[PDB]
Design a protein around this nucleic acid. Structure first.
Ligand SMILES: [Mg+2]
Ligand SMILES: [Mg+2]
Ligand SMILES: [Mg+2]
Lengths: 242, 121, 145, 527
RNA sequence: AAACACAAA
RNA sequence: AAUCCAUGACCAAAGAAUCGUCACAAAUCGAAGCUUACAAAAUGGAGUAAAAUUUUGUUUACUCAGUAAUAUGCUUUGGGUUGAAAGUCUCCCACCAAUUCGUAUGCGGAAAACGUAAUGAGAUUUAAAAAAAUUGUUUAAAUCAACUCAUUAAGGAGGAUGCCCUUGGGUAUUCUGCUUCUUGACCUGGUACCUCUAUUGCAGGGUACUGGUGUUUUCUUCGGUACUGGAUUCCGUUUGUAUGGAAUCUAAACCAUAGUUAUGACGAUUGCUCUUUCCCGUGCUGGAUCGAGUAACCCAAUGGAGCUUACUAUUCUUGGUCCAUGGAUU
């Protein structure tokens, strides 16, 4: 079975309310995903590290899969999961995870500075670490922190969707994915589809060939994409429940 | 008392045996589906119309399950018939120290109900 | 000796990109809305030229030179949008990545390419295509109820 | 009931008030008229049987049948439908009346054990084409007929045919008028012009004066599950031709015969039987020399190295460092001596030590060195002075299984068991059978229940708990992939003491070159 | 491609 | 002349193995298998709990096969298979007390342009190689090695010689000589007997005998018998044979512990060859680091055997031989 865990939600902050058109486009994208052939879907929601987290428990997730996607879950026959990434820049206005880890399932981070990489490798209870594949990677990915974050259990996420947007950022995406493949030594590499429109969706064969031509062996691709994604989902569920 | 049971008399000429699956108690479900699909594809080359699915005893439940699968999954007409099967059992009758297997064998009849399940193309 | 061939089966799927209209969530409904039809401006030389352009645009010069040695479209009809691309066993990954990186037709936009089956002979490809066509009819018959 | 059976023969020898018997092998004994007893078996052991019979012939008459009586085997469901299509009757008889209905049964296991049909048949060269019998009452075949078959039986004609085949006078009178192919050709050419000019007959009628009556016997076997048919030596060829003429009949060989015997549950005499004398002798010899020739034929760097195989047994000892037994043959002498040493270790102390002109053996390495020294001494002279493994299935029920410094005097009983693989693995011949230890007993149980991946499929890519060395309790003689069930069937022989030792039926299997341990469960076989 | 022939080369 | 060391030439053997992984109620680059239908619960099973019924009987609510089966899963192997898959080489893949290679002929073998053994000879001056297949070189031509052709029928007994041995016995060679027995090259003529064509002379066939090369110049196949896929129906039968006669419709015979342009993708482990290192005992398919390489011919299309021809130079290896040369001692 396949696992897609990088579907973005059309909402960046808490203040902006979502519209019906965005929900319709997300439904189109998820239906296209299920049409191409998938089993697990985990939509992602982006938020900033400086934005004020609300002091609530029943309002942390502006998704509400049960009332919105619960009917599609029963009809088309798939499941949905909640995932949130942390766009961290500076160690200020933070120091809170025991409340954001229980509501959502998977907790990710997005470091954009050299101090962000240290803060992610040292003092974040996260499962996946992702970079801005569209623009330039912050300073330099080294084996020093990557090895120490992979030996504990944190994997590196690669967004193959960011390449399908424009023509110019393809060069930066390739230069970053080859760098992270060379640094990670090809053990903890998870793949995700960061597309919000149904016109940027692909199948397993094409993505496998792309990641293979980018520098990943054939066994690593399948083994990771399946087992590591399933294990990340299971670890997230265990963190939410017990 | 020691008693052994032999199979039931099967008199099939040349083609009743081909387009017929005998569902055992240890036969898996997916293997039965595969064999039924192969039989359904090979029937019109054998020259018949339907596929016989015979099971008796413990396998009757999963035989009916196999039937109900193709009932709505492939939308194929099924026919269920209830028949009787006579089996001969060798029993030992009391009449020095000999082998348990080498004793007086007497044949006894036993009737059991079974289900034949035909599937069309 | 034998020339090692490897045929590639691909499908053209049109995502129903229309946010103003509400849609039905089911199996056969989305199968029909994704397998609607191919436009009239669809042929073999128009898809081959597009894939040849995309190959040079993504891989480069040598990447197109090594791949364009035995790159041919053997069987394709616009009624079902099913095509069989012949290539080497060495350059199968290249052709698959190019079919994945297919953006759009020069005049028709909003479409994706899905590689389904890859094999080294046309008989197994035809058998798998027949099996897929037979499987498609089942959900249709079930939903027509 | 004069039914044919397949038992285990023995070599009895009494000189003066003493009786010592040795395991001989198989045999087929059949009784007729309570006096005429026929015994059929392997020629190599038939010589010794004939010898030990002729040595005691003061009140008994012996008759050899090696070139005057022949038998051929039929196997399958439609085997009797072709044998009937070939055979015909000269005179009315109830034997044929029953055989006609039996030919339509199509199931051999439905028929009872007692089934012997004998009569006088026509020469198969007489028939032109193998015409099938009347098939009109095929639908009206119930169990009442099989019930009545056990009651209705013409014993008189059966005994008459048996006495005709046994007596050498009627057997020679059968060769009175053996017509030639030219004779039958001329008779068929002159049958063209007969008195009834309305029906075309391509056959020739039988004559009670100028024609030979041929005695034939048909018997069914329960163990082998086949139909044997006995016919004189010179009469087998015409029957064999018309039998092979049936376009659903192929010729089965000794290799395929061994395959069929191994498939169900059964055993072959020279290849499988490890406890008889001549069978085990020739097995050890031929297999060891053939494997050694194939091994020394290949050069270094081209054959599997049994000498250098790491991590085979946990806490490796510096005695062999490679294979524990013989690199080529499944040697039971080493197993016997090793188990005797382990039993002596348990008799000297409750625990056993591994590492540290008879020496005070205190470790397993001392027993391994004794085994190697015995083999080094055997390098030149003959082996199997007494025996290595007997079989005592009935003796344990009779009295008991009962457990100086020899380590090679008393042998160790084995039982014929069939171990089947329940998980990923492929067995081969000359395989090693180990017993599951006590510490990692739940791991194998969980693996046999199920251990899947988060993806959903099974998961066996883990670290295996390599067991110790003193746990080998058997050797697989017939290792072949079972095609009737879809798994790997292993035919081995385990120790009865180790069988009663374990509280479970779980047993590990290993190859001779492979360092992986598969799991399975064994079932007893009474052969 | 393979495989075939009292061919053909 | 003996031994050792190094090179070169030639003959012979083999073609390392083990584990894990790859979405779709079906899949894969592919393949096969998990079908002699039952848990003695069908001689109209075994019992418990409540109501009513004067016990039976009846209506409700449960237990027992438990080593229990577990839903497109599960196990296995796949291009040298007891080395060449390569090759315009040969042969088997119905039988025939016999116009049918009735061939007891050195041995083995069903056959084979098949393997091998002892002796003698030979080189377009020869039985035949130079001015059917195969192969880049394509046997030899001081000696050896290799090719070709010509002889040697199986078993038992006696004598002589040679060896261990000196009652005696065992092995090898050579001479005399017996046993191994299916009234058969083919074909023509004459005579004698029997049967059919329903009297005979005569016409044809068979058998027993004698005589003869007799135009057997078609010096390459020319004899006899045999419906081998499946379904159903009709008719006769203790007067005779215990089974026989005929009819309709379809096209299948579909089969590989690789099977029909397939035999994939990488990861990990041991072992094999050399080189730069340290230790016990010299040494030891003695052990551990720094490194390089895992070959080539080449690839199935129905199965088996024989032969020939391609391979192994830092483009893996192994064993032996050499009246081949090179160095050293006696
Ligand atoms: Mg070929
Ligand atoms: Mg060819
Ligand atoms: Mg060929």
């Amino acid at each position: 079975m396949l696992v897609d865990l990088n579907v973005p939600w059309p909402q960046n902050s808490y203040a902006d309310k979502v519209t019906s058109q965005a929900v319709n486009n997300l439904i189109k994208t998820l239906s296209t995903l299920h049409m191409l052939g998938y089993t697990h879907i985990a939509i992602n929601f982006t938020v900033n590290h400086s934005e004020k987290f609300p002091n609530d428990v029943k309002l942390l997730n502006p998704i509400d899969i049960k009332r919105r996607f619960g009917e599609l879950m029963d009809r088309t026959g798939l499941k949905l999961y909640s995932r949130i990434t942390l766009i961290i820049d500076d160690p200020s206005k933070g120091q809170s995870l025991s409340k954001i880890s229980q509501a959502f399932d998977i907790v990710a981070a997005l470091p954009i500075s050299e101090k962000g990489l240290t803060l992610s490798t040292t003092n974040l209870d996260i499962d996946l670490l992702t970079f801005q594949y569209g623009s330039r990677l912050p300073t330099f990915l080294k084996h020093k922190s990557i090895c120490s974050c992979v030996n504990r259990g944190v994997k590196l996420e690669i967004v193959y969707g960011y390449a399908l947007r424009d023509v110019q950022a393809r060069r930066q995406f390739v230069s970053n994915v080859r760098s992270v493949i060379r640094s990670s030594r090809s053990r903890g590499i998870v793949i995700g589809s960061g597309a919000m429109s149904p016109l940027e969706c692909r199948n397993i064969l094409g993505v496998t060939s792309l990641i293979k031509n980018l520098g990943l062996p054939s066994d690593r691709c399948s083994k990771a994409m399946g087992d590591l994604a399933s294990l990340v989902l299971l670890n997230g569920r265990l963190r939410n429940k017990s | 008392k020691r008693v052994t049971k032999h199979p039931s008399l099967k008199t099939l000429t040349h083609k009743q045996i081909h387009t017929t699956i005998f569902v055992k108690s240890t036969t898996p479900y997916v293997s039965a589906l595969k064999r039924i699909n192969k039989f359904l594809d090979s029937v019109h080359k054998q020259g018949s119309s339907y596929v016989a699915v015979l099971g008796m005893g413990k396998a009757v439940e999963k035989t009916l399950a196999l039937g109900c699968h193709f009932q709505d999954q492939k939308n194929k007409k099924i026919e269920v018939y209830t028949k009787t099967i006579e089996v001969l059992d060798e029993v030992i009758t009391e009449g020095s120290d000999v082998e348990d297997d080498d004793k007086e064998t007497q044949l006894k009849k036993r009737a059991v109900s079974g289900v034949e399940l035909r599937i069309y193309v | 000796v034998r020339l090692k061939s490897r045929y590639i089966l691909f499908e053209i799927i049109f995502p129903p990109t229309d946010t103003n209209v509400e849609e039905s969530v089911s199996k056969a409904d989305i199968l029909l809305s994704h397998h609607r039809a191919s436009p009239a401006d669809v042929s073999i030389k128009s898809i081959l030229q597009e894939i040849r352009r995309s190959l040079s645009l993504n891989l480069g010069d040598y990447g197109s030179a090594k791949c364009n040695s035995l790159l041919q479209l053997k069987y394709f009809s616009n009624k079902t949008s099913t095509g069989i691309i012949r290539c080497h066993r060495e350059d199968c990954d290249l052709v698959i990545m190019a079919l994945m990186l297919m953006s759009k037709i020069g005049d028709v936009d909003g479409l994706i390419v899905n590689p389904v089956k890859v094999s080294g002979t046309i008989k197994k490809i035809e058998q798998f295509a027949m099996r897929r066509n037979s499987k498609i009819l089942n959900i249709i018959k079930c939903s027509q109820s | 009931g004069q039914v044919l059976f397949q038992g285990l023969i023995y070599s009895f020898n009494e000189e003066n008030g003493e009786d010592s018997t040795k395991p001989l092998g198989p045999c087929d004994v059949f009784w007729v008229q309570k006096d005429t007893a026929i015994i059929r078996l392997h020629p190599s052991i038939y010589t010794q049987v004939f010898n030990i019979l002729l040595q005691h012939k003061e009140k008994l008459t012996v008759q050899d049948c090696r070139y005057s009586l022949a038998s051929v085997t039929l196997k399958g469901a439609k085997a009797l439908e072709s044998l009937a299509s070939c055979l015909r009757s000269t005179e009315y008889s109830k034997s044929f009346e029953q055989f006609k209905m039996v030919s339509m049964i199509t199931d051999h296991n439905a028929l009872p054990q007692r089934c012997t049909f004998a009569f006088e048949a026509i020469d198969p060269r007489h028939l032109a084409a193998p015409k099938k019998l009347n098939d009109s009452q095929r639908k009206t075949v119930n169990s009442d007929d099989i019930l009545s078959l056990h009651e209705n039986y013409p014993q008189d004609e059966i005994n008459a045919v048996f006495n005709e085949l046994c007596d050498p006078e009627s057997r020679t009178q059968s060769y009175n008028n053996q017509n030639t192919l030219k004779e039958i050709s001329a008779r068929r050419y002159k049958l063209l012009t007969a008195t009834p000019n309305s029906i075309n007959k391509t056959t020739v009628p039988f004559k009670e004066s100028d024609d030979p009556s041929i005695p034939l016997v048909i018997i069914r076997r329960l163990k082998t599950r086949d139909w044997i048919v006995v016919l004189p030596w010179f009469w087998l060829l015409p029957l064999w031709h018309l039998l092979n003429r049936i376009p659903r009949m192929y010729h089965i060989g000794l290799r395929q015969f061994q395959q069929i015997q191994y498939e169900n549950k059964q055993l072959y005499f020279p290849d499988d039987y490890p406890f008889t004398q001549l069978g085990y002798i020739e097995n050890s010899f031929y297999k060891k020399e053939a494997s050694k020739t194939k091994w020394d034929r290949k050069p270094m760097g081209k054959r599997i190295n049994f000498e250098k195989i790491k991590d085979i047994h946990n806490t490796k000892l510096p005695a062999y460092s490679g294979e524990i037994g013989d690199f080529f043959s499944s040697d039971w002498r080493f197993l016997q001596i090793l188990r005797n040493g382990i039993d002596y270790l348990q008799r000297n102390d409750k625990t056993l030590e591994l590492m540290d002109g008879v020496r005070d053996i205190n470790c397993v390495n001392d027993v391994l060195e004794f085994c190697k020294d015995y083999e080094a001494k055997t390098k030149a002279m003959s082996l199997s002075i007494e025996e290595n493994i007997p079989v005592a299935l009935c003796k344990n029920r009779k009295c008991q299984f009962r457990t100086s410094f020899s380590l090679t005097f008393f042998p160790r009983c084995i039982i014929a068991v069939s171990c089947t693989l329940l998980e990923r693995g492929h067995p081969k011949d000359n395989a090693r059978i180990y017993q599951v230890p006590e510490k990692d007993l739940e791991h194998w149980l969980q693996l046999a229940k199920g251990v899947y991946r988060p993806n959903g499929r099974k998961d066996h890519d883990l670290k295996i708990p390599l067991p110790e060395v003193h746990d080998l309790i058997g050797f697989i003689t017939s290792g072949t992939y079972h095609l009737n069930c879809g798994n790997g069937m292993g035919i081995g022989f385990i120790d009865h003491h180790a069988a009663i030792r374990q509280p479970t039926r779980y047993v590990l299997i290993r190859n001779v070159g492979t360092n992986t341990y598969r799991l399975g469960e064994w079932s007893k076989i009474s052969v």
